[PDB]
Every structure is written in structure tokens, then in C-alpha cells.
């Protein structure tokens, strides 16, 4: 009763579904592509399934140095090649 | 629309089936359509189970619960529970699935198309809940139906091929039952047995002659009580004891179904006779006993004297005594010494496990059976990872016994809750306070204060 | 009519979601703590801080995803995005556990924003502020567990990680290392939580079963009108019922409802005090008199002594993988095990 | 001393139950 | 006669917009092999 | 790390010749191991006799050596004790006792090679986890 | 009136200070039997061989325990599910050694507590109330049946029932997690939601009612004297409370119907505790919580640990250590 249009009037209107039959799939597809292009891995730094370990490595790339942690990760990533 | 909203019927949408309490034609349709759902599931699940069923794996390794019921009734199985003919399983599924369409058609018909009440159409089919003599008549018809149903199991066992006998000489096999136990000191003796350990009440029934003879007694009791209820009206003490209403009769059934659900949970968990281990896997007790046996066999093959080996505590590592002196397996499985199974009974003597038979007479089929049962214990995770909670992923196994016991405990419990809900409500509704306290004659205000 | 008063007018407008001055704090901080949690659990690993996969992107499910704590080597660093550890690199900040501190700090300020909202709305509508006062307990729990506990410890690494199973690890860590079940402050917490759920169940059920018949429907919810002056249920009948069943009963509705505030709020405060002790390892780990007796009498056994052995198993079997900064190599022969298993 | 102390406190609680039930302030309708 | 854009509209879309994006991302993750 | 040819190259026999499995027969071997063997040999141990595992170093000291494909396949045809003194087909699953172990019935020679490949590859992947038991979980 | 009609009127009398009733004629002897035996056992019972391994555990105060460590120890593993009343023992000393008191207490208790539920139905009927307080009580009742009876049945021994003591309770919980991964079982998780939510809702409802109390008193007196027992008027302004809480969240999130609100307060912890009880009672048949141990594997096949894998290490530590002398074979099967 705060003056906004009721939700059950909006989502039953055709103008809402003209708009949202485009915006809702486009968002869903944009999320799908963030993963399937691999951009999600490069934005967040998450390992792909073949980038946890070097080929004969069994040890974990744990960060041990506070002020050079940024370099420890980069040295761990450069050992993935 | 008749009784299809809250204002006209007094019940909200979420109590919507209570609008059917006095509409016997729509209520009949609810029941017939729901019976169709049950028969549909039985049919659809069997065909699902059969479509997935690998004949070369045991049934219990395959997440099957209906195929074991059919195999236990004698269909599709040869010696040792091996499957020889998948076609009886196909028939049971198909015929259920087709009959569900007939029940579904008649349920939907009476629910939506036919007369809303039956009392104008027919005096035989219409009923009042308050009509005690009509209620016992419908009860009597249904008892006769159930009594014939018990005799069908007797008919299958005696005159139509038999039942799977896990205890049959030479291994489990489908055996025609020729001499069922008719003697009531045995049949009704099971009713008087303690439910506790070593006794087990009716769960301890361990031979098909007692199973079949009990079903003869139950079928004739149900037919006799069926006739009795058609011919009598509830006596005076019964009329003063019970609430006589639709919700009350529902509550009484809910109490009965809950009790039966709890009994089935124990049946599937402990009984390896009507739930043969070759179909359902080993029981919890059976697997634990199978482990002690397996390591007894291995260690004895290495040269160990098993009757004289001390465990860490001083009790015998492989063998010890029960609290009444019987020689039993040691370790934690001391709790399961009342386990009885066809793979283990040849090692038992008068005093329990016989040490000379253990030294000399364990066969390779018993060694294979013990190892198979130890590795198929009913322990697994909800995502069907077999073994203890600490196990790694690999084995995809949860025993049918675990699935059947857990499901039926859950169902029996909520049906107990439903009994309490409906029994309390039927009491209150009959006395007339189910909708609340009347503000004018509040009963507590007419009572003396407690202090 | 200055700019402050016009801004105050707009912030306090009747709308679908009330904003307020507290909403300036609450709404960004809550959105970021919530959004940071979903972002981290969807896309962010814990591989460099814990050696764990913790995201849907790596294959975890809702039970196993977490935004995990930073590495122990970070100490109690705020781990700001612009700080000396990430140096402005967002990708590295996520890899070092900067999302944990992001969620914890924005969660903290959001919780403040939420209690400020409770005060602001209660003041505007003209009710007393007991709901804000009751919210002090979840705040006390959040501050003690998520901030004071790791601040007492070596680093943020030992705080709870924001995940379902990660929290379960936190629970089992506190058993094995702190014997937290033995702690009388936790016990007071349990009593307040379980006593609170009991009061919730019993008060709801008592009201529903002493209702006055105020209408003709068998479904009785329609018989209530919020503008009625009359009590909807019989306090007198409820009192007589409980006095005869249990011996005692409420007879004052105001005391009843206060006691319902008091019980879970006091319990949560008590547990918070226990966790503050555990920040400094001031545990109620052992009963000295039983340990003296058990050491000298190898036949004395209790459930307390059995629990200590369980705790020793937890520590030894979990520490190498739970604390990978320590580089514990526990050879198989040093691990405590009973016979056979 | 310990055992006596625990039993003593317990026994007082049981006594308090007795007074709280049988010697409560009586609920009076007013 | 009602407005379209409100504080309510903003609050809805600050949640619903990333939610649908995240649901598409997580759906695509179901088809990643190792 | 990937599942390379060099990970998938296992000794074919005892003389010294190797075979490199494909990723498809590694994954069929893990599937067939799980179906036929993992109830007793989950993770490379042996639940019903823990003294003997499926570590390559234990398979090498068996008689005849089982640390190669041909040695492992032969065990699945005619299993023996660890010293090769007793044939144990009446209590261990094999093709000659496929009547009493019905999961052994339709296993082909390619299926036994796939299982044998999985047993030899898996320790190169898991290290001491394979055959180590709950200590390495 | 005959003596039976007079006795029945006494039993079902609403004028008795404590209501007896027909359930009460069972509840009263059973609960007194369980209480008396519990108190004596907790103070004075000698050590009990819980694990059946001649390794007796001291549970009573006189034998070295305090309030926190003391317990009535579960009956012996050698007994299993066997019924062990006093008459089955050759002497009280044997009954004590084997944990007889535990069976006596839990059996009388469960029978007594079941009749407490019936007695709650019974009085509500005599008072003209609606009958469903007893349904709410069925949640903790089911929980008690789960830990004292159903869990032992599925595990095959009353030695696996929860001990009657505080540290004994903790031992039961830790071993349960080791063996069943209860934390990863959704029924336990619903239990937690039931109890945290219940405490939350208890705090919320208490606080909102207290916040909306109508002024009838001065500052120098407790606001609780503003309510008179059995007054007809509402003592709080539910419209004010709805107006607050619907602005705290949003309007449609808040109850304006007190009957709906109180039903929710009933249903939330009750349904949650029912799921908790079913959790225990289904783990009684070893259908365990989710196992994700080694669920995450890299491209080579390396196990990548998750938080579930860290839980498993803790679970392993409890498992290898629990009942440290009782196991003779590699698998813990019951
Ligand atoms: C209304 C009236 C009812 C109330 C009135 C009071 C009634 C008292 C009833 C006493 C029941 C005692 C509980 C113990 C049950 C138990 O040990 O149950 C187990 C027994 C089976 O016992 C086992 O039975 C076994 C039978 O197997 C034997 O026989 C088999 C033959 O195949 C195999 O060979 C097997 O190997 C061999 O051992 C053995 O004897 C075992 O040693 C023995 O333990 O089940 C049983 O007898 C079947 C019944 C079990 C019911 C389960 C109760 C569940 C109730 C839940 C309540 C929830 C309440 C919520 C409140 C809100
Ligand atoms: C109230 C309700 C509302 C709640 C408000 C919402 C939250 C507001 C925001 C809170 C954010 C807090 C971040 C504090 C970080 C911290 O403290 O960071 C910690 C640092 C100290 O750093 C630590 O210092 C340690 C000691 O080092 C010292 O010793 C070492 C060994 O000798 C070396 O010598 C080293 O060089 C030397 O500095 C280690 O190095 C640790 O790794 C390093 O993290 O203190 C400092 O920043 C500051 C210390 C002084 C202020 C402390 C007040 C706050 C803490 C209160 C809780 C006390 C907890 C006690 C537990 C009980
Ligand atoms: C097993 C489940 C089950 C069954 C058999 C019923 C049956 C019934 N309900 Mg109940 N109900 C149920 C569950 C069930 N309900 C649930 C879960 C709820 C909560 C949502 C309700 C809430 C509820 C309310 C509020 C009401 C009922 C009512 C009714 C009755 C009349 C319905 C009607 O005429 O509407 C007409 C509906 C239609 C015409 C839609 C067509 C639906 C058809 C029947 C579906 C069948 C499809 C099937 C695949 C086709 C089979 C054909 C084939 C076999 C040949 C009917 C006897 C009504 C009543 O009691 O009135 C007196 C009523 O008011 N129900
Ligand atoms: C609980 C089961 C049940 C009950 C009590 C009723 C009762 C009724 N039906 Mg309904 N009906 C049902 C199921 C049921 N029906 C099913 C499954 C269908 C789909 C086939 C129908 C389709 C249907 C139609 C189209 C009509 C009725 C009618 C009637 C009314 C008169 C019937 C009569 O006098 O025939 C006399 C009965 C006989 C001569 C014997 C019955 C015939 C069958 C073949 C015997 C089967 C018996 C056997 C034990 C079944 C085992 C089933 C088990 C496997 C589940 C009566 C109220 C009529 C009506 O509504 O009037 C307005 C009507 O027109 N029914
Ligand atoms: C679904 C099955 C069913 C149902 C619902 C009924 C229902 C009824 N029967 Mg019927 N009856 C049935 C089957 C059934 N009967 C059968 C199969 C027979 C033949 C054996 C009979 C023979 C029969 C007779 C002779 C009488 C009834 C009567 C009645 C009415 C009252 C019963 C009563 O008070 O119960 C409650 C029972 C009691 C209060 C007796 C004491 C029970 C104790 C307290 C409990 C003992 C059981 C306990 C749980 C232990 C179980 C295990 C134990 C064996 C060790 C009620 C309408 C009475 C009637 O009015 O008929 C006109 C009556 O006289 N029935
Ligand atoms: C044969 C068994 C049986 C029968 C015929 C009835 C019949 C009735 N019940 Mg009862 N009830 C039962 C068992 C039964 N109940 C049990 C076992 C319980 C304990 C849970 C109850 C508890 C109960 C309550 C609390 C109430 C009733 C009510 C009623 C009446 C209306 C029901 C309705 O419209 O629901 C409509 C159906 C729904 C609203 C949907 C329910 C959905 C459930 C909760 C979850 C579904 C389970 C499913 C496996 C989980 C979700 C799966 C997912 C994949 C979708 C009707 C007389 C009402 C009443 O008293 O009327 C007088 C009422 O308030 N029943
Ligand atoms: C009410 C809103 C609110 C609050 C209280 C916070 C609070 C916080 N944020 Mg968050 N943030 C917010 C909204 C908020 N944020 C929004 C809307 C976004 C998206 C744009 C972010 C994005 C964000 C990121 C990416 C990060 C934070 C971080 C932080 C933490 C450190 C902030 C800091 O040190 O800045 C210091 C600045 C101030 C405190 C300003 C105070 C105002 C002064 C008194 C006025 C004078 C300043 C002067 C004019 C500046 C001139 C400088 C000149 C001399 C060169 C702190 C908990 C960091 C964190 O979480 O670390 C783990 C972090 O990495 N925030
Ligand atoms: C009333 C009502 C209701 C209900 C409903 C119901 C319950 C119904 C039922 C229904 C039913 C219950 C139905 C059934 C159906 C069936 C069918 C339809 C069948 C089919 C069959 C077929 C066709 C098959 C085929 C085949 C074969 C033969 C062989 C093999 C293969 C196959 C499978 C293909 C509701 C709730 C909704 C609501 C409203 C009202
Ligand atoms: C088949 C079989 C068998 C047989 C069996 C039999 C023979 C059975 C019977 C059964 C029976 C024979 C049963 C019965 C039951 C009963 C019941 C369960 C009861 C109930 C009751 C009640 C419910 C009541 C109530 C009340 C009271 C108490 C008071 C008053 C009121 C009233 C009435 C309500 C055997 C095991 C050999 C084997 C297997 C198979
Ligand atoms: C961190 C960060 C940030 C932020 C971000 C954000 C703010 C985010 C957001 C985000 C979000 C906002 C997201 C969303 C998501 C969502 C989701 C993912 C959902 C899901 C759902 C589902 C899954 C459903 C399900 C369910 C439930 C829950 C319950 C009921 C039942 C059902 C089944 C329906 C920034 C850049 C500022 C800065 C830097 C850092
Ligand atoms: C468990 C073993 C016993 C099984 C019992 C089953 C036997 C079946 C018949 C029993 C008869 C019960 O019959 C019942 O007896 C009582 C007491 O005698 C009668 O008498 C009763 O009268 C009224 C109510 O009617 C009561 O207020 C009064 O206190 C009582 O004497 C009941 O009205 C009658 O219904
Ligand atoms: O008692 Mn008590 O805890 Ca049930 O699992 Mn087996 O049994 Mn013993 O080890 Mn683990
Ligand atoms: Cl232990
Ligand atoms: Cl053992
Ligand atoms: Fe209230």
C-alpha cells in the first residue's frame, strides 16, 4: 500500500514479458558464456582441472610469505608451464 | 460448485480433502484414483527396475526393491537365487501398469463426473459414517477380500510353484510348501514371543512352513471376522468406547498403519527368511557375523588356533561365549550372536559354533558367502557411497534393507503423528470444541481454582 | 528546510523497502557481503590458502563450497584490495583470501547497519527497541566467532570459513582442539538455543490449542482480525492446562513474552563469552582431578576420559591437512589408533 | 565433599520444585 | 498510473540480475569435464 | 597435470615391453574395476585380506610377478596365492570360476587388459593413496 | 456410585492439582520408577562393562565422577538387544556390572514419556481445548525414542544408546559423527534449522510483543504489572508490531494474523525436530550423511581436497580411536 505497482499486476502484464523474455535469457546466456569461454578462470584465478599441479608435482602451492604472496602465486603459476 | 471453497465447506484449500468427508461419491473417486497411483507405481517401478536390471549382478547391488519381492514369491529364480527368467517380472509390471489405468479411469469418473454422494443412487453403496452397522458391513467385505489375499500367498506356495526357500537343503531354492504349520501353539506362539533380542516376536519366523501356515490362519480369521462383521452390529461396550465418525475411523487406521510400518522396518532389517539375503543383501547382523567368519577362515588357513586366540581385552579373538554359554563369534559381533543364516548353521553344534566343524568343515561356498556378505553390509551414504562414512568414493551401494527400513521408519512415524492428529481432532469434533473455546461457556471458568 | 531535512524526508519515505539513514550503511554492506559470498562460492578457489577446491567452478556442491579464510601466513592482515599483499590485483586478492575479509568486514558493518535499522524503525513507528536489543546476541556471536576468535589465534586462517562443510570443520575443530562441548559457556548456549526452540514450539502450540471460537470455519485462521481488542486465545485455560500438566504455568503474558526474548538471547551471549575464552586457548579442556586419577589408576575410565581419546584422534588425523602451513609430517606409526581399525 | 555438594544442590532444586508447584502464588482471575 | 522505476525496482534488480547470470554460469559448469 | 601417454604407459610383460593405454581404456578399466573388483579392492587395498594389496611393489614380489599387464591378466584367469602355490579360483573371482562369480561372466580379454591397466596406472596417479588405506584418505 | 465409578471420577478429575488421567496411571509409576533408579544409579552405581569387553566404565558420583562426567552407563554390548530386567540376573551385583539400571531407566522412561504425550491429549479433552499440544511434544518424544531405542535396535545393542549423562551425551555425538557423518545429513541440517530458527523465532516473537506493549504502568514498576491474568483486552498492539516488522523487512514478509504467526512458531521447530529425530532413526539403519570424499578429481586423477575431505580426516580420527579395545577385524560393521 506504499504506492508501488503490485507485483502480481506487473508479472502478469504482457509488457513485462515482452521485456523479460529477452533480458532473462540474455543474462542466463551471459553467465553461461562467462564459464564456457573460460573468462571465469582468468578473472578469479581459479585453476582449471589441469592447472592444480605441475605434471609430476604432488605438493600444494601454499602461500608462505605475507608481503611477497603476490609473487609466490605468480611463481607457482609460472611453474604450471 | 458444491463444497469446493472455504466459505461453503468450512475448510481452506490446504485442508481441501476434508471437504469430501460427507460426499461419498467424490470420496470413493479419491480412493479409487489413489489406488490407481499405488498400482501405477508398482507397475512403473517394476518396469523401471527390469529395464535397469543386470542379470549377472546380485539384485541388492542394483538398487532394486520390487524385483526381490517377486523373486521371493518363486518367480524368475533358480537355485541360490540366480535369475533364470526375467519374463515374470515383466508381466507383474505390465499387468499392474495396465490395471492402474482402469483404477485411474474409475477414480477420475467418480471424482469429477459421477454422483457427488452415493446415498441417493444406492442404499448398498451409500453410507453414513454414523451408521455403525453399515460401517461394520463395509469392514466385513474388506476383511473377506484381505483374507482371500492371504490365501493367494498360500495358493502360490502350495499349488502354483512354491516360494523361494533360502533354508532349503543344498542352498536356496524355490520349494513347494507341502506341510504348512497348522498347529496354533506354533502360529500363535510367535505372537507371545518377546520382541527383544534373541526372541524377535513375529520377526523371528524362520521357515516357510510357519509363514504359509500363519497365512492360512490369517486368511480364515479374516474371512470369519469378515462374516462376523457383516452379520453383527457393534456391541454396547464398543459403542461407548469409540468415536463413531469418518475422521475417527481414519485415525484408527493411521494408528494401525504406523504399527505395521514399524513392524515392516524390523522385518526387513532382521529377517532373512521372507527377505532372502540373496535378493536383499545380508542383514546388518549377517554382515558383521560374516566378517568374523572371514577372518576366522583366513587366520586359521595361516595356522592360527582360533579357539585359543586371545583378543586384546582377554576375550577370545574369534570365539567366545554368549551370556548363556553358547560358543559365538568374538569382537563387536558378540551382540549379533542370535543371527541365524543358512551359510552359518552347518558350523553350529549343540553348544553353538562347533570348533571341530570350524577346523575341518568350512566349505569354499561358505568362504565366498562370508566375504560377499562382509563387503555388502547395509552401510552407505545418502548419495549411495557404500561402506562406512569414512570411506572414499568408489563403490556405489546402499543395501535395499537400508532403503526399505529407513523409508518405512519415516512413514510409520509420520503416520503415528497423523493418528495423533486425527484422533485428537475426531474426539474434539465429536465433543464439539474443535474450532475453539466458546467465549460464553469457557469450561475452565466454571472450574474451582487449583489453589 | 535545509538539505539535511529534505534528505531525511526522502530516506524515511513510506516505500516497499524502507531505507533510512541506517540503510546507507546497511544496504551496500549487506549486498556486498551477500554478493561476495555467492561470488566466492561460485568462482573462487581456496587452492593457494588451504589447498582446497571450494567453488562450484571447481566441482563442489552447495554443501562443500566456501569462501575460505586467508592463509595463516597473512596473520591478521586486513587484506585490503589496495593493500600491500594484493597490491591492487583483483585476481591475486581472490587467490590470497581477500574475499574472506571482504565478507567478514562488510558483514560486520552490515550487521551494525541492521541493528541501526531496528532502532530507526522502532523510533519512527513508536515502539520500544527490544528487537534491536535481542539482535545484540547474533552480533555478539558474529563478533566473537568471526573476529575475536581469529584475532586471539595466529591468523584469520583459523576463523570459520563461510561455507556449509567449512563450518562443520569449525565445529569438529572446536571439539578436537578445544573440547568445546565441555565448556560451561557453550552448555549455557545450548540450553538457550534448545530452550528457545522449546518455548517457540510450546507457545505456538499452546496459543493454537486454546483459541476462542471466533468464527464458523474449521480452518481457524480466518477468525482473527488485527483490529480486535480481545485476546484471541484463552490465557486462563492455557494456564490451567499447563499448571496441571507440568506443575507450573505462565500467568502473565508480558512476562511470558519477555522470557522468550531472554532465553535465546542470554544463551547466545553466554556462548560468545566462551568463544572469547577460546580465542586465547582458555579452554575447559580437562578436569584436573580426573586426570590425576586416570594417570595413576589404569582401571579408571569415564565418558570424559573416552572423549579425550577421541579428541586426540581428531587432532592427529586432521592437523596435517587442516593446517598445511605447519608442514606436519605425521608418520603412520605416530598416529593414535585403537586395535584393528 | 564433592559428591555431597552436588547432591545437596540437586536436593535443593527438587525442594524448589515442590514449593514452586504446591506453594506458588495462586493465579487469580481479576 | 504507477511509476516504473522505484527504490523497489532497484532492489529487485540488484538481486535478480546477478542471480540469473550466476544460474547460467553454474548451469554451464555442469558440462565441464576434467 | 593431464593424463598423458607417459602416465598411461605400463609394463606389458615382464621381459620389458610396455604398452601405452588410451584414456578410453583407462576409463573403461576404472569402470570395470568398480563394477567387478572395488567391493573388495576400493582404493587398492583388500578388505577381506588386508595383508595383500594392489600396490605395484607388492604385485612385483608376487609369484609369478603381477606388476605387468600379462601378469595381471593371467591372475584374472587363474588366481593364485602370493607364492603361486595354490590356485584360489574357488574363492577369488576369475574367468574359470565365472559360474560362481557371475560378474566375471562376460568379461572379455580387452576388459581384463583394461582392469589390469587401471590397477597399474592408478598408483602412478594416486601415489601412496593407492593401497595405503585410511591413513592416506 | 460404586467404588469403580468413584475411582474413575477421581482419576479423570480436573480439580486435582496435577491431572492424573488414564495415561497418568501409567505415567506416574513408570516415571517415578525411572527417576528413583536414575538418581540412585547416577550417585552410586558401580562401574558398568558397556563394551562387553570386561573394561568397566565408571559413571557414578561415588566412583569418581562429577556432575559433568557422571552418567548412567548403557548396558553391556554382550547383552545386545536382549531384555535384561533384575530377575534375569543371578544377583544385583551382576545386574549392576552388566548395566541393568540403564535398561530399567530407559524402558520406564520411554513408556512414561509416551504416556505424558497421551496425558497432554487427555487433559486438553477434559478442558475443552483443541488437542494438538501433544503433537508438538511428539517432536522431543521422537527424538528420545531415536537415541534410546531406535538407534540401539538398528545397531543391534542398547550399548549404542545414548548414555544418561552429560559427557556420555558428547561421546554419543562424536562417535555418531565418526560413523554416520551426521553433520552432512540433510535431516540433521533441517534439525539445526529447526532449532536455530526456533530460537530465532522465539527471540523475534518475544521481542516484537515486548516492544509493542501498551502503556499501563509507570517507570518505577515492572511493565509486567500492566497485564492482569485473565483480562479480556489484548496487552500489546499487534498492528504496531506488524507495522514495525513489516518495515524492518517488507510488508508481506510480516504476519498480521496472530493465529498464523503462532501456528508458524509451533510448526517450525516441531517439523525441524521431527526431521532431526528421523535423521537419527534412519542413521540407525546406516543410511548415512553425504559422502563426498574424493569427489573432486583433477585432469590427471589427483584428488583435490574439499572441506568435506577435511571433515573426513576428523571423522577418521574419532573412528580409529573410539572403543579402542573393542574391535578385532578391519571394518566397523555395527
Ligand atoms: C498400542 C500398543 C503398542 C504399545 C504398547 C506397548 C508395547 C510394547 C512393545 C515392546 C517393543 C519393544 C521395542 C523393542 C523392539 C525390538 O527390539 O525390535 C526388534 C524386533 C526384532 O528383534 C530381533 O529379531 C531377530 C529375529 O531374527 C532371527 O530370525 C531371523 C529369521 O529370518 C533371522 O534368522 C535372524 O538372523 C535371526 O536372528 C533376533 O531375534 C534379534 O536378536 C532381535 O533383536 O522387532 C520386533 O520384535 C517387532 C516390533 C518392533 C517395533 C519397533 C518399535 C518402533 C516404535 C517406534 C516408536 C516411535 C515413537 C514416537 C513417539 C512420538
Ligand atoms: C563492537 C560491536 C561492533 C563491532 C565493530 C565491527 C568491527 C569493526 C572492524 C574490526 C576490524 C578489526 C581488525 C583488527 C586487526 C588486528 O587487530 O590485527 C592484529 C594486529 C597485531 O598484528 C599481529 O601481531 C602479532 C604479534 O606480532 C608482534 O610479535 C611478533 C612475534 O614477536 C613480531 O615481533 C611482530 O613483528 C610483532 O609485531 C603477529 O605478528 C600477527 O601475525 C599479526 O597479525 O593488531 C592491530 O592491528 C591492532 C591491535 C590494537 C587494537 C586491537 C583492538 C581490536 C582487537 C580487539 C580484539 C582483541 C582480541 C583479543 C582476543 C581475545
Ligand atoms: C491422491 C491425491 C488426491 C486425490 C485423488 C484428490 C481428489 C479430490 N480432491 Mg483433493 N487435494 C489433493 C490431493 C488429492 N485430491 C492435494 C494434494 C491438495 C492440496 C492442493 C488437494 C486440495 C483439494 C481442494 C481444495 C479440493 C479438493 C477436492 C477433491 C475432489 C474433487 C476434485 C474436483 O472435482 O476438481 C476438478 C479438477 C479438475 C476437473 C481438473 C482435472 C484434473 C484431473 C482429475 C486430473 C486427472 C489426470 C489424469 C492424468 C487423467 C487420468 C485419465 C485416465 C485414467 C483415463 C476429489 C475427490 C475438492 C473437493 O473436495 O470438493 C468437494 C476441493 O475443493 N482437493
Ligand atoms: C472401490 C471400488 C469401487 C466401488 C465401491 C465402486 C462403486 C460404484 N461404482 Mg464404480 N468404478 C470403479 C470402482 C468402484 N466403484 C472402477 C475401478 C471403475 C473403472 C472400471 C469404475 C467405473 C464406474 C462406472 C462407469 C460406474 C460406476 C458405478 C458405481 C456404482 C454402482 C456399481 C454397481 O452397482 O455395479 C454392480 C457391480 C457388479 C455387477 C460387479 C462389479 C463388476 C466388476 C468387473 C467386478 C470386479 C470385482 C473384483 C473384486 C475387483 C478386484 C479389483 C482389485 C484388483 C483392485 C457404485 C457406487 C456406476 C455409477 O456411478 O452410478 C451412477 C457407474 O455408472 N463405476
Ligand atoms: C481390520 C480388522 C478389524 C477391525 C477394524 C475390527 C473392528 C472391530 N471389531 Mg472385529 N474382528 C476382526 C477384525 C477387525 N475387527 C477379525 C479378523 C475377527 C475374528 C477374529 C474379529 C472378531 C470380533 C469379535 C468377536 C468382536 C469384534 C468387535 C469389533 C469392534 C470393537 C473392537 C475393539 O474394541 O478393539 C479393541 C480391542 C480390545 C479393547 C480388547 C483388548 C485389547 C488389548 C487391550 C490389546 C491387546 C493387543 C496388544 C497390542 C498386543 C498385540 C500382540 C499380542 C497378540 C501379543 C470393532 C468394530 C467387537 C464387536 O463389537 O463386534 C460386534 C466384538 O465383540 N471383532
Ligand atoms: C491415509 C492417510 C491419511 C488421510 C486419508 C488423511 C486425510 C486428511 N488429513 Mg491427514 N495426515 C496424515 C494422513 C492422512 N490424512 C498423516 C500421516 C499426517 C501427519 C503428517 C496427517 C496430518 C494432517 C494435518 C496436520 C491435517 C490433516 C488434514 C487431513 C484432511 C485434509 C487433507 C488435505 O486436504 O491435504 C491437502 C494436501 C496438502 C496441503 C499437501 C501436503 C504436502 C505434504 C506436507 C508434503 C508432501 C510429501 C512429499 C513426499 C514431499 C514433497 C515431495 C516433492 C517431490 C513434491 C483429510 C481428512 C487436515 C485436517 O485436519 O482436516 C480436518 C490437516 O490440517 N492431516
Ligand atoms: C556503507 C558503505 C560501506 C562501508 C562502511 C565499507 C567498508 C569497507 N570496505 Mg567497502 N565498498 C562499498 C561500501 C562500503 N564499504 C561499496 C558500495 C563498494 C563498491 C564500490 C565497496 C567496495 C570495496 C572493495 C573492493 C573493498 C572494500 C573494502 C572495505 C573496507 C576498507 C575500506 C577503507 O579502508 O577505505 C578507507 C576510506 C575511508 C574509511 C573513507 C572515510 C571518509 C573520510 C573520513 C573522509 C576524508 C577522506 C578524504 C577526503 C580523502 C582524500 C585523500 C587525499 C588526501 C589523497 C571497509 C570494511 C576493502 C576490504 O573489504 O578489505 C578486505 C576492499 O578491498 N570495499
Ligand atoms: C481426482 C483428482 C486428482 C487425482 C488424480 C489421480 C490420482 C488420477 C490417477 C490416474 C491414474 C492412476 C492413471 C493411470 C494411467 C495409466 C496409463 C495411462 C497406462 C498406460 C499403459 C500403457 C500404455 C503402457 C504401455 C506399455 C506396455 C503395455 C508394455 C511395456 C511398455 C509400455 C510401458 C510402453 C488430482 C490430485 C490431480 C486433483 C484433482 C482431482
Ligand atoms: C501371518 C504370519 C504369522 C501369523 C500371525 C498372526 C496369527 C497374527 C495375528 C495378529 C493379531 C491377532 C493381532 C491383533 C492386534 C491387536 C491390536 C493391535 C489391538 C489393538 C487394541 C486397541 C487399539 C485398543 C485400544 C483401546 C484401549 C486400550 C482402551 C479402550 C479404548 C480402546 C478400545 C481405544 C506368523 C507370525 C506365524 C508367521 C509369519 C506369517
Ligand atoms: C565481491 C565483490 C564485489 C561484488 C559482487 C557482487 C555484489 C555479487 C553479487 C552476486 C549475486 C547477487 C549473485 C547471485 C547468485 C544467486 C544464486 C546462485 C542463486 C541460486 C539459487 C538457487 C540455486 C535456488 C535454489 C533454491 C533455494 C535456495 C531454496 C528454495 C529451493 C530452491 C531449490 C529453489 C564487487 C565487484 C562489488 C567488488 C569486488 C568484490
Ligand atoms: C485387557 C483385558 C480386558 C479386555 C476387555 C474387553 C472386554 C469387553 C467388554 C468389557 C466391558 C466394558 O464395558 C464398560 O464397563 C464399564 C465399567 O464396567 C461400564 O460402566 C461405566 O459406566 C460409566 C460410563 O458408561 C462410567 O462413568 C462408570 O465409571 C463405569 O462404571 C461402561 O459403560 C461399559 O461400556
Ligand atoms: O558400541 Mn558403541 O560405537 Ca556402534 O559402530 Mn561398531 O558398535 Mn561400537 O564400534 Mn563403532
Ligand atoms: Cl569411545
Ligand atoms: Cl570387532
Ligand atoms: Fe505470543
Author numbering:
A (entry chain E): 4 to 84
B (entry chain C): 23 to 473
C (entry chain D): 12 to 352
D (entry chain T): 1 to 30
E (entry chain F): 12 to 45
F (entry chain V): 1 to 137
G (entry chain A): 11 to 344
Publication passage describing the model:
The SR structure of PSII at an atomic resolution revealed that OEC is a Mn4CaO5 cluster organized into a distorted-chair form, in which the cuboidal part is composed of Mn3CaO4 and the outer manganese is attached to the cuboid via two μ-oxo-bridges. The overall structure of PSII obtained by cryo-EM analysis is very similar to the SR or XFEL structure in the crystalline state; however, the PsbY subunit was visible in the cryo-EM structure but absent or partially visible in the SR and XFEL structures.
An overall atomic model of PSII was built based on the highest 1.95 Å resolution density map reconstructed from the ARM-60k dataset. At this resolution, the features of cofactors and water molecules can be easily identified in the map. In the PsbO subunit, a disulfide bond between Cys19 and Csy41 was observed in the XFEL structure, but it was completely cleaved in the cryo-EM structure. In the C terminus of D1 subunit, a part of Ala344, the C-terminal residue that coordinated to the Mn4CaO5 cluster, flipped out from the OEC and adopted an alternative conformation in the cryo-EM structure. The Mn–Mn distances refined under these restraints were 2.8 Å, 3.4 Å, 5.0 Å, 3.1 Å, 5.6 Å and 3.0 Å for Mn1–Mn2, Mn1–Mn3, Mn1–Mn4, Mn2–Mn3, Mn2–Mn4, and Mn3–Mn4, respectively. In addition, the occupancy of the OEC atoms refined with Refmac5 was found to be lower than 1.0 (0.87).
